[PDB]
Amino acid sequence: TSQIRQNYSTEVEAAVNRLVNLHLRASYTYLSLGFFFDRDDVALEGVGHFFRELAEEKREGAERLLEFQNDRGGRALFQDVQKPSQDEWGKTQEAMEAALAMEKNLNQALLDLHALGSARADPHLCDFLESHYLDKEVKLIKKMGNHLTNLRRVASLGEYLFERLTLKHDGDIESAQS
Template identity: 40%
Template sequence: MNTGSCSSNSLHILNVLSNNSSRFAIQASKEDDTRSIPNVIFEPLEEVKTKLHVIPAEPQASLARQQYNEQCEDALNEQINVEYSISYVYHAVHAYFDRDNIALKGLAKFFKDSSVEERQHAEKLMEYQNIRGGRVKLQSLLMPLSEYDHIEKGDALNAMELALSLKKLNNGKLLDLHQLANENNDAQLTDFIESEFLADQVESIKKISEYVAQLRRVGKGHGVWHFDQMLLKEAVAAA
């Protein structure tokens, strides 16, 4: 038996095993890990060094703002104005039906509640604007009408058709805002609009559509008083 040859072969095998194992061994040192498994280890302290410039030093600048496009910020301010404007109109309609010579208390309450709801939507949008680091810029409101009677339709149907039109207009504005958020890859804004507004808008449009259909059936006479009483009962049941 050639011990020299055996020793040489054994040494060769050990070298092969050693070379092969080095390719699969889990290295203990931090430096070897980062070289052996690139783009896997997360080093927050190293990465944040390259992003320190993202945090503004100016006292007027928002510290919370992140990936919030200026187009979305401006559109959100426009939607705040839409909500306040519609609330303003509803409040004027409430005042009309609350007059002593009109005295339709159910319609008056319906439009007052609608006004409060739209104002709350505006406030919710303002709060969101601040959360995202935007700047709330309130705009002017146009004076709404004070008279809502109509020769053919009567005041109740005329006002409810106006409410339906405003609901659809508002829903369209919210969908435009949602589309703009999608185009700017703002997932947080799209989720906010979907979860806080869109479902409620669809339900409200359906509800007011039914009111319009009912008022078209009852005409301008005594049936309007019964419809008004129905609104009062619904308000009491919902309270």
């Protein structure tokens, strides 16, 4: 009924609303992780900052899907952001596997959205995804896999050394380009 709504199926409009809730829940989990590794009894502040500046990006990916919902004339329907899966994540390895299994699951939702959009012949949606989400997500998953193998390589002196030499070293340059 919107005046600007054109070639925007309701199945896509609803599949997008379930994708913003996924991004928000994924930003909530990363927020929980980033505030778990700054606890006094873990103190892996490099990992904490990594997950923190990851929640920033996930939430930004959520509001970029909402402004796309408005540009196409859809109606944003919010749902309850379900709480993270765990409150204790454990060693950084068992946490980065719970953060990679959440990306590979969030990336699967993006691929299903792109499959749905190509099924209803929505070129603008497929372009928007291809441009803003898919490549970022495969690069993030690649980075997490690198972190995971480096963590299995130093497997807890090795975990401290990893947080100091890899994660902190990149957190320093984030604060430089920021």
